[PDB]
């Protein structure tokens, strides 16, 4: 579930280009539920109406998937070969990369035991949010108390893996907030805990994919200068 801060992003009529799926590099782990929903949707209508958003990888004949992991992964699993895509000026100042702030209403202790059991630490720390925003720890866990979860990407992934299982189990009301202050505004209405990491930079996203590595789901949150207008492409054109 997603809460976004009413971003008036303009639709623009930008033409698409067909790009081969094997030229596209993911930056996030897939979510099988989203992959599955896309497969049902595209095979149902037979129309692919929403182009990929790509960025050229410097120094490679490859493209970063900015938006479209489950379209990409879904087309591949169907045996398709290309997707209509819009190529972004990614390093333009007009493109911004934020993160998501996974927040939860629910009980802290079940989450701690599940986090601790995967090898993560949860040390109580009133500078945890400050450390996390500087990128010094993996996550700050902020509710009634503040806790630091140390480490880097490996630890962040473990945290995401645990949260998604407990969202699957129904032990928390997992909402990914676009902005953490909206998680704190809703927190004051009386959310329980909010996870905060430093946002990825564009440069880090590109580095990670050149390494053949990926983030957890809901790590990047791109704010773009436009949404492409809808397109008229038949599924059969993609094979
Ligand atoms: N028939 C379709 N053609 C093209 N896109 C579709 C179709 N049905 C659903 N979608 C889109 O596929 C997307 C699935 O998520 P996607 O953007 O690929 O992953 P992520 O945003 O995590 O990179 C959704 O935006 C959804 O609206
Ligand atoms: O360049 S491609 O052949 O991959 C796709 C075209 O850009 C499709 N355009 C052609 C011009 N009109 C709108 C669709």
UniProtKB/Swiss-Prot annotation:
Outcome after substituting residue 34 to A: Decrease in activity
InterPro entries: ParB/Sulfiredoxin_dom, ParB/Sulfiredoxin_sf, SerK/SbnI_C, SerK_C
Biological process terms in GO annotation: cysteine biosynthetic process
UniProt entry tagged with the keyword Transferase: yes
Phenotypic consequence of gene deletion: Disruption of gene does not lead to complete Cys auxotrophy, but mutant displays a growth defect in an amino acid medium depleted of Cys.
GO molecular-function terms, A-Z: ATP binding; kinase activity; metal ion binding
Alphabetically ordered keywords of this record: ATP-binding, Kinase, Magnesium, Metal-binding, Nucleotide-binding, Transferase
Binding site residues for ADP: 41, 47, 49-50, 67-71
Cofactor (UniProt): Mg(2+)
Entry binding sites for O-phospho-L-serine: 66, 68-70, 100, 218, 220, 222
Residues of the active site: 28
Residues annotated as binding Mg(2+): 67
Catalysed reactions, semicolon-separated: L-serine + ADP = O-phospho-L-serine + AMP + H(+)
Pathway: Amino-acid biosynthesis; L-cysteine biosynthesis; L-cysteine from L-serine: step 1/2
Its EC number(s): 2.7.1.226
Outcome of swapping residue 2 to A: Strong decrease in activity
Classification via Gene3D superfamilies: Conserved hypothetical protein from pyrococcus furiosus pfu- 392566-001, domain 2, Conserved hypothetical protein from pyrococcus furiosus pfu- 392566-001, ParB domain
Family per similarity comment: Belongs to the SerK family.
Function: Free serine kinase that uses ADP to phosphorylate L-serine to yield O-phospho-L-serine and AMP.
This protein's name: ADP-dependent L-serine kinase SerK
Lineage: Archaea, Methanobacteriati, Methanobacteriota, Thermococci, Thermococcales
